[PDB]
Amino acid sequence: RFLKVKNWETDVVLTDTLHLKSTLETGCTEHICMGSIMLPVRTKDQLFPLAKEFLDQYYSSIKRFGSKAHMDRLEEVNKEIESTSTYQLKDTELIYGAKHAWRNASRCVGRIQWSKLQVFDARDCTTAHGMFNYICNHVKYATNKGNLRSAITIFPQRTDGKHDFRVWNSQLIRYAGYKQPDGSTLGDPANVQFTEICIQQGWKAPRGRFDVLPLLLQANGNDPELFQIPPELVLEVPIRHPKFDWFKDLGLKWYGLPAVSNMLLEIGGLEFSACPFSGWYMGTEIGVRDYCDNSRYNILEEVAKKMDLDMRKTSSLWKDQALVEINIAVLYSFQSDKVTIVDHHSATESFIKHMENEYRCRGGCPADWVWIVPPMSGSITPVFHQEMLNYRLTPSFEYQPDPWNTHVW
Amino acid sequence: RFLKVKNWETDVVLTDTLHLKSTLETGCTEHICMGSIMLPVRTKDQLFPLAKEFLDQYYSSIKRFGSKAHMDRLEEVNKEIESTSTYQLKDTELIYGAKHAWRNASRCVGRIQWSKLQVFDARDCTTAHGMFNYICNHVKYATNKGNLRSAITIFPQRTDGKHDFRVWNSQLIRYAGYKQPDGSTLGDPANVQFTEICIQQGWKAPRGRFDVLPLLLQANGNDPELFQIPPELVLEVPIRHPKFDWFKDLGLKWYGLPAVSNMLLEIGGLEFSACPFSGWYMGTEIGVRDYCDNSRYNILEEVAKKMDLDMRKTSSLWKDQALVEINIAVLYSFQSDKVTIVDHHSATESFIKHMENEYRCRGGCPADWVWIVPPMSGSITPVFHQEMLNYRLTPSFEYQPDPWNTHVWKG
Ligand code: HEM
Ligand code: HEM
Ligand SMILES: Cc1cc(N)nc(C[C@@H]2CNC[C@@H]2OCCN[C@@H](C)Cc2cccc(F)c2)c1
Ligand SMILES: Cc1cc(N)nc(C[C@@H]2CNC[C@@H]2OCCN[C@@H](C)Cc2cccc(F)c2)c1
Ligand SMILES: C[C@H](O)[C@H](O)[C@H]1CNc2nc(N)[nH]c(=O)c2N1
Ligand SMILES: C[C@H](O)[C@H](O)[C@H]1CNc2nc(N)[nH]c(=O)c2N1
Ligand SMILES: [Zn+2]
Q: Which residues bind (6R)-L-erythro-5,6,7,8-tetrahydrobiopterin (chain B)?
């Protein structure tokens, strides 16, 4: 019930007690581990225990647990739920909640940063045009001319579930994908379905390889509307290599701002279904996953050829050699253009320091090793050798399914 | 019930029913996943059900379930248990059991090979000298002058737990490690403690960087005895690089035969505490883990120095660049000397084919993603994108603690 985690490289042992505060279910059982599975309203009765649990943790954090102001706030919230079937968070509670949802995000390697998060309260937003304005401002603030700053923008909470705010896009900034008569895919194959929905709703597609998608915004449960983010707000980086002059000839670019827009933020039982957030990239996301996944831009074969490597046998490790060069290029290009990026060595080193901080100050740190270990060079980063316990704490970010299933037009 | 797994690269979905035959616990609960935790005598009462479950599985596999031969064997084993507190496996059952423990080993990427396993029955062994001879024969057979063949040697099972056979070595072939007074290590830092034990037991250590360790063998719960494997039986490969001629002067070599000697084989409730087994290497084990782990030979810096990489910032990815060249060197060296080895691209592609076949014919394939995904270039292998279900089937191989912690010294 008190659990140990060992680092096998350093022999450092840490004791986890924080897991006893976990509430939600993992998908694992005593008989079966689902650690590698990607995907393993509320009544008046359900809501007050969730609110109380959150408010207790909040008052504890500002060292006024059990105080008159603590008790008075639970009373106020209880009265509000009984009378209105929901409640409203104070600004201080919203900021605390959002920061802790990131602190609790077990799949995030970048959580050393969790307390530096700019929270934009968009709970007064009522229309899709309002949503577009908030999102442009988020984009501009976070981008900050390349000196990226972590931010979240929080739209109104769920009510009856028929008036949801949703950003239909999976990220604020992504590239279009189109199925070709030729049979191949042009652009990002990951975005073919979404690009189609955009065209159906009226988007005039440039039909290129790196077309920034428009936002499809849903306010108050209405049908979503299309908006183009001002091109001058979307900072993009041309990819070149410090040694290979031909690398720029591939015509690769990526955008500077990673901004997740499809998750659900739960704070004290309240559900924020549109809460786009952003930080900055770890280079392997772009160089390993976006560029080299077979189902993505899939560029390994082209780079390997330009490198004149022996592609006749797998054991020459041509894929591995080209992978490294692609990742050198991504980091170099971002660094040369003064756009914030972190390499996987540096990000995982910081995460180990964050884990030790959290064990020290909080009694643990939920972490999902399958996601935390980078998709290349796993065992030469310190997280590979670090045992991690994965469990679910609230406030939380949760995946939600694409709304084009949910939505009735 | 039915559990589904998806491959996120192919959208291929598979359905697991095999997990319903899982008995043992994972370490995980509804509230906590322990998937990255490395370590998450029986009564008559507990033994006959385990025996029966195993014999039922064995007789099904031979299409004789419920036959007179099946029923007679259940009866025979039941009588043996009630009267002697244990029972003996037939040779055929032992072979079946050992093959299935491999087939069930969820951390093993090499399982496409499971049904091709040479089983050496060493249950007539009585002394450490006898163990030494069996192990020499296993090494010679498995090595096969570089054309490696999978094998396992099975010593007598546990009785009262006071008479255990154990190989104290974690692998049959490993290099010594020596902590120096200045805090540095000569040789393999993974083997410092075991090396100190060998020396205490009377081994004359050459004190070099790649000294093959002697075997330390316990028969019948007696104190272990030291034996040197004949050097002519230990195949080794000097490591060189196809394009970098200075790579040879790093002085690196490795042994060809990976042979795990510290695991416990459970078949039908019986416990084989000494069951050394061997296959062949995947290149990354040596080039990534043995050479490049910080707590092992730790050669990354020296290699990248010689490659004249920019080592001022981790973001030049010098470690990644040096890692790839070291792994090319290991594969090239083994291949050039005609010693069996498999690269991680080939091994993972074969594992996916194995797993898909297993889902079709067996209803599942337990797999531990944390271990199956290679320690370099993870996502450019198909296994990275494959959802896996981890659960425990028997027969099985299990970790057991090192014997020096538990051994009752007799003197
Ligand atoms: C400050 C720089 C940040 C870095 C370097 C970083 C790093 C990462 C990385 C590499 C991943 C895995 C991404 C993937 O493979 O899809 C991730 C996941 C995630 N992070 Fe962060 N992160 C940062 C900021 C943030 C912020 C600001 C938040 C929320 C306020 C956040 C919450 C999450 C969540 C919920 C996931 C899982 C996403 C999913 O399930 O798709 N992170 N982080
Ligand atoms: C034939 C070629 C084989 C290949 C290429 C192969 C590959 C591997 C690899 C790469 C690992 C992980 C090693 C590590 O990180 O320590 C492993 C683990 C393992 N394999 Fe295999 N394997 C082979 C044969 C065998 C055989 C013959 C057996 C037993 C009969 C076996 C049973 C196991 C077990 C029990 C583990 C887990 C070891 C532990 O927990 O320490 N494998 N295999
Ligand atoms: C089925 C499924 C479930 C789930 N929870 N997430 C996904 C999204 C899948 C999971 N890895 C690939 C795809 O996301 C890529 C976007 N993630 C990055 C931008 C997150 C990020 C990084 C750095 C900073 C930051 F703020 C956010 C899919
Ligand atoms: C705490 C702990 C638990 C556990 N189950 N295993 C270990 C052993 C740890 C696990 N990775 C490092 C150390 O094994 C090194 C040996 N592994 C190879 C030889 C297995 C193998 C490969 C190829 C063929 C073959 F037959 C066997 C440690
Ligand atoms: C099947 C497996 O769980 C899946 O491919 C995971 C593995 N680890 C990952 N890790 C990160 N950071 N992001 C991912 O998308 C994935 N994909
Ligand atoms: C902490 C973590 O579980 C541990 O370092 C694991 C990760 N994956 C591994 N995978 C393999 N094949 N072998 C290992 O020793 C390990 N070590
Ligand atoms: Zn689990």
A: 36, 370-371, 384
Q: Using CA atoms, how far apart are residues A212 and A220, in angstroms rounded to an integer? A: 26
User: Can you tell me the distance from the alpha carbon of B32 to that of A390, in angstroms, rounded to the nearest whole number?
Assistant: 6
Q: How far apart are CA B309 and CA B157, in angstroms?
A: 54
Q: Which domains does chain B have, with CATH numbers?
A: 16-123+150-160+264-278+348-372 (3.90.340.10), 124-149+164-235+399-403 (3.90.440.10), 236-258+281-346 (3.90.1230.10)
- Pairwise CB contact (< 8 Å): A35 & B370: yes
Rounded to the nearest angstrom, the distance between the alpha carbon of B293 and the centre of ligand 7 is 26
Strands A13-16, A3-6: pairing is antiparallel
CA B185, CA B188: separation in Å to the nearest integer?
Answer: 7
**How many Cβ pairs closer than 8 A exist between chain A and B?**
203
- Distance from Cα A349 to the centre of ligand 2, integer Å: 29
DSSP conformation class of B182: T
Element (H, E) at A305: helix A300-306
Does A250 reach chain B within 8 Å, measured CB to CB?
Answer: no
Comparing alpha-carbon positions, the chain A residue that sits nearest to B326 is: A317
Give chain A positions within 8 Å (CB) of B393: none
DSSP string, A167-216: E-SSBSS-B-EEE-TTSSEEE-GGGHHHHHHHHHTT------SS-BPPEE
How many residues are given for chain B?
A: 411
- Coil, strand, or helix at residue B171? strand
C-alpha distances out from residue B60 to A136, A172, B52, B65, B269, Å? 65, 56, 12, 5, 18
Token representation of residue A13: 């042992």
The helix (H) or strand (E) run that includes residue B325 is: helix B318-336
Give the whole-angstrom CA distance, residue B377 versus residue B390.
22
Strands (E), B36-169: 118-121, 151-154, 166-167
Count of Cβ atoms closer than 10 Å to residue B201 Cβ: 14
What is the rounded end-to-end Cα distance, in angstroms, of chain B?
55
Q: Which residues contact B187 (CB under 8 A, 6 or more apart)?
A: B175, B176, B177, B178, B195, B208, B209, B210, B211
Say if CB B330 and CB B341 are below 8 A apart: yes
- Those residues with Cβ within 8 angstroms of residue B167's Cβ, 6 or more apart along the chain or in another chain: B131, B135, B215, B216, B217, B218, B261, B262, B274, B276
DSSP notation for A69-126: HHHHHHHHHHHHHHHHSS----HHHHHHHHHHHHHT-TT-TTGGGTT--EEEE-TT--
Quick one: resolution in A?
A: 2.0
| CA–CA separation, B17 and B343 (whole Å) | 31
- Report the gap between the CA of A183 and the closest CA in chain B (Å): 17
User: Is B120:B154 a contact under the CB 8 Å cutoff?
Assistant: yes
Residue B227, beta-bridge partner list:
B215
